[PDB]
Swiss-Prot record:
Subcellular location: Nucleus; Cytoplasm
Residues covered by the RRM domain: 5-81
Lineage: Eukaryota, Metazoa, Chordata, Craniata, Vertebrata
Family label: Belongs to the CELF/BRUNOL family.
Name of this chain's protein: CUGBP Elav-like family member 2
Amino acid sequence: GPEGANLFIYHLPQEFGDQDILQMFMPFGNVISAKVFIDKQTNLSKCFGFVSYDNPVSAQAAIQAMNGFQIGMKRLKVQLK
């Protein structure tokens, strides 16, 4: 995740996994890695995670479009690392 190409995404539906956030974020550029952080004992998602582009412009673009975007019952908080 070269800087400033890295996002933290909070308020993510519990059901989302790595691939879901990756795909949700590809509209803004090539996502090169994505991880949803999971409680290791339950395997339930902790509802945030990490998106990493291959350039920072994509990351800004994504932040402006997605921060505050409502999906399900939650609104995503998306910020730069």
